[PDB]
Amino acid sequence: DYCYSARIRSTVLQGLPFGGVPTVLALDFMCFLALLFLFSILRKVAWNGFCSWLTAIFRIKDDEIRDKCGGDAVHYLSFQRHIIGLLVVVGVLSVGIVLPVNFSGDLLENNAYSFGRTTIANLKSGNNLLWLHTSFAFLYLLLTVYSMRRHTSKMRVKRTLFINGISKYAESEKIKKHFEEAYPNCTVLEARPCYKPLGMAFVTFHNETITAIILKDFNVCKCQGCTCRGEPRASSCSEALHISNWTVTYAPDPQNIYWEHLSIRGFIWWLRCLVINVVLFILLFFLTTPAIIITTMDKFNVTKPVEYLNNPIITQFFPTLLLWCFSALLPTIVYYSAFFEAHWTRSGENRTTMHKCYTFLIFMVLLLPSLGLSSLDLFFRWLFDECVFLPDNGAFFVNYVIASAFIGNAMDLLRIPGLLMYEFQFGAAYAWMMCVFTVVMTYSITCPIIVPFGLMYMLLKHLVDRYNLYYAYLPAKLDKKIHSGAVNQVVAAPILCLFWLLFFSTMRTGFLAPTSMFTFVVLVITIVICLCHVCFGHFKYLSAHNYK
Ligand SMILES: CC(C)CCC[C@@H](C)[C@H]1CC[C@H]2[C@@H]3CC=C4C[C@@H](OC(=O)CCC(=O)O)CC[C@]4(C)[C@H]3CC[C@]12C
Ligand SMILES: CC(C)CCC[C@@H](C)[C@H]1CC[C@H]2[C@@H]3CC=C4C[C@@H](OC(=O)CCC(=O)O)CC[C@]4(C)[C@H]3CC[C@]12C
Ligand SMILES: CC(C)CCC[C@@H](C)[C@H]1CC[C@H]2[C@@H]3CC=C4C[C@@H](OC(=O)CCC(=O)O)CC[C@]4(C)[C@H]3CC[C@]12C
User: Fold this and answer.
1) b vs e for 486-523, b when ≥16 Cβ sit within 10 Å of the residue's Cβ?
2) 220, 222, 224, 226: CA torsion to nearest 10
3) For residue 12, what are the CA distances in angstroms to 114, 115, 379, 392, 450?
4) Distance (Å, whole) CA 388 – CA 380
5) Do 121 and 107 contact (CB within 8 A), yes or no?
6) Residue 55 belongs to domain spanning
7) In this structure, are residues 351 and 481 in contact, taking their beta carbons and an 8 Å threshold?
8) Residues 6+ apart with CB under 8 A from 119
9) Do 185 and 58 share a structural domain?
10) Is 536 among the domain residues?
11) Do the Cβ atoms of 79 and 145 come closer than 8 Å?
12) Which of 129, 138, 134, 127 lies closest to 509 in space, CA to CA?
C-alpha cells in the first residue's frame, strides 16, 4: 500500500531528496556568511575592529533604543517581539504535535527521503486524525488574536471638517448659514475657504456627534427608488454651495494635505487608480511565472525516470532566489508608483501603500504560486495516461522562507551602507515581515516543518532591526494608524491558514466530508465577526486593539 508504487512506474513526479532543502539551506547560509564578510569590509571602508559590529548587536539596552528613537521604534520592536514569541508556541505545537501525526501517514511510506512525508499529503483521506489539523488551524487563530491583544494592551480639531468642491465665488455668510438652517440643531464656530481659494474649506462645529452627522449627510450609502445615497439636503444658501457636487471629510492638519492631488474626484480619479493598479497586477503575472516554470520540469514524452530531475541548485535554490529578488524589489515599485495615483492625504497614501505592498506580495508569493503549483494537470496526465498535493509537496515555500531568512536579512544590513562608487520605512518593513509571516502561518498546519525556518526568519530580522534602528536609520516619528493597521494583517494570516486548509481538504475529499464542513463553518463564523468590526461597529471588545 503506497501512493506512487515506484517499483511499477519510476515516475519523475516523486520529487527531490528532502525537497532540495539541504542544498537550498547550505547555499543560503554560505551566501549569508559571504554577505556578512562583505558588509564588514564595507562598514570598515570609511575611516574598533573587523567584526566589532557583531558584538554591538547584543550589548545595546532596550532603554537606549527607547531613548534615542522614540516610541514608534519601541511599538515596532514590541510587534516583532510578540510575533517571535507567537511562533515559539505555534512552532512547538507544529513540530511537537502536528509533525508526528503527519509522519505517521501510510501514504508516502515508499520514497523514504521525500519531503512530502512531513506534510498533510501523507494522510490518507477519511483517516480520523484529519480533525487535528482543522483544530490547530482554529487554535492558531485564537493565539494570533490573544498574542495581539497582549501587544496592543501594552501600548498608548475633533469638531472640524474639510469641505471640498465649493465654487471659488462662494461666501462665508452662506456657507455658515447653510448648516445652522439645513441642520438647525448645529452651531457653527468657524467657516473659512483656503489655499483666491481653490474651492476647499475648513468648517468647525460646537459638537462632535453633530459633526459626524453633518459629515455623513454628504457621503452616506442609504437609498430610495430615485437615488442610491443620501443626497445633501437643500437650503436658501444653495447657490453658493453646489451641494450635490461636494466631498466632505474630517479635517487633517495641512502637513497631511496634498494641495496638488485632491484637485480631481469621482470617476476620473477612479480611472487613474484602476489603470495604475491593473498595470501592476498584469506585471505581477510575468514577475511570478519564471519562478513557477523553472520549478516545474515534471513533464514527459522523454525525460521521465526519477533520475532526470535537475540539481536542486536550478530546481529549488535558483527560482526561490529569483522570487526573493522580485519580492524584495516589489516594495520599491509600489512606493514609487503610489505617488502617481494622487491620494488626497500623505497619511492615506502611507496607510494605503502598506496594505498594497502586502496584498501584491501575497498575490505574487503566496496566492498565484499556490494556484500555479496546484495547477498540476501533471497528475491527470499520469493518472489517465487522494494523492494530489503541490509538486515537491510545498518544499518551494520552505525554500522561500530560508532564502528570505538568510539572504534577505544579510542583505538588510547592506540596505543602508554605500561609498561603493570606486528614514526607516515603517510601512514597507511591516508589509514585508507580514508577507513572510503569512506564508509560515498558511503552511504551518499543512506543512509543519516550515515553522522553524519561520522563527529564524524573525530572530534574524529582529536582531538586524534592533541593530539598524539604533545605529543606522534616522530616528523617526510616525502616524500611529499604521501600527494598528498591521495587527489586522496578523489576523488575516490564520484565516488564510483556514482557507487553504479548506482548499487542500476539498480537492482531496468532498465538501460534504465533515472536516471540509467544519473548516467552512469556522471560516464563515470567523469572517462575519471580523467584518462586524470594520464599519458596523458592534464588536469593539474583541479580536484586537486593547489600548491604554
Ligand atoms: C485576480 C485579480 C485581478 C483580482 C483580485 C482582487 C484584488 C486585486 C483586490 C481584492 C481586495 C483588494 C484590496 C481591498 C482593500 C484595500 C485597502 C485600501 O486601503 C485602505 O486603507 C482603504 C481605506 C482607507 O484608506 O481608509 C487599498 C487597496 C486595497 C489593498 C485593495 C487592493 C486590491 C485587492 C487586493
Ligand atoms: C484565494 C483566496 C484566498 C481569495 C483571495 C483573497 C484575497 C483577495 C484577500 C485575502 C486576505 C486579504 C487581505 C487581508 C487583510 C487586509 C487588511 C485590510 O486592512 C485595512 O483595511 C486596515 C484599515 C485601518 O487600519 O484603518 C486591507 C485589506 C487586506 C490587505 C486584505 C486584501 C485582500 C486579501 C489579500
Ligand atoms: C461569501 C464571503 C463571506 C466570502 C469572503 C471572501 C473575502 C471577501 C474575504 C476572505 C478573507 C477576508 C479578510 C480576512 C481578514 C480580514 C482582517 C480584518 O481587517 C480589518 O479589520 C481591516 C479594517 C479595519 O481596520 O477596520 C477584517 C477584514 C479582512 C481584511 C477580511 C476581508 C474580506 C476577506 C478578503
Assistant:
1) bbbbbbbbbbbbbbbbbbbbbebbeeeeebbbbbbebb
2) 20
3) 13, 15, 11, 11, 24
4) 10
5) yes
6) 12-156+266-531
7) yes
8) 102, 389, 393, 394, 446, 447, 448, 449
9) no
10) no
11) no
12) 127
Q: At 38, list the grid cell.
A: 562583505
Are residues 314 and 198 part of one domain? no
Pocket flag, ligand 3, residue 139 (CB < 6 Å): no
* SS3 of residue 163 by DSSP: strand
Q: What is the DSSP secondary structure assignment for residue 11, as one 8-state letter?
A: B
Q: Which residues line ligand 1 (CB under 6 A)?
A: 281, 348, 351-352, 355-356, 359
Same domain, 359 and 455: yes
Residues whose CB falls within 8 Å of the CB of residue 265, separated by 6 or more in sequence, listed in order: 164, 165, 247
Find the distance separating the first CA and the last CA of the chain, reported in whole Å. Answer: 59
Residues 198 and 319 in one domain: no
Which CA distances in Å does 76 have to 58, 474, 492, 543?
A: 18, 15, 19, 20
User: What SS3 class is residue 179?
Assistant: helix
Question: Could you identify the atom of ligand 2 that is nearest to the CA of residue 482?
Answer: 25
Nearest CA to ligand 3 atom 7: 527
Looking at the structure, do residues 309 and 365 belong to the same domain, yes or no?
A: yes
Residue 2, classified by CB atoms within 10 Å of its CB into exposed (0-12), middle (13-18) or buried (19+), is: middle
- Residue of the CA atom closest to atom 11 of ligand 1: 359
Closest listed ligand to the CA of 349: 1
The verdict on the CB of residue 125 being under 6 Å from ligand 3 is no
Number of domains in the chain: 2
For residue 432, give Cα distances in angstroms to 81, 361, 425: 16, 8, 11
Q: Which three cell numbers stand for residue 158?
A: 475633533
Residue at grid coordinates 543560503? 28
Reading the block at residue 243, the C-alpha cell is 451641494
Best residue among 359, 438, 530, 547 to mutate for probing ligand 2's pocket (most ligand atoms within 8 Å of CB) is 359
Hey, what amino acid is at 204? T
Cβ 492 under 6 angstroms from ligand 3: yes
Mutate to test the pocket of ligand 1, among 262, 334, 359, 434 (most ligand atoms within 8 A of CB): 359
Chain-centre distance for alpha carbon 197:
40
* Number of neighbouring beta carbons within 10 Å of residue 56: 12
Regarding whether 199 and 146 lie in a shared domain, the answer is no
The answer to whether 372 and 391 have CB atoms below 8 angstroms apart is: no
User: SS in 3 state form for 51-98?
Assistant: CHHHHHCCCCCHHHHHHHHCHHHHHHHHHHHHHHHHHHHHHHHHHHHH
Alpha-carbon distance of 260 to 194, in angstroms, equals: 13
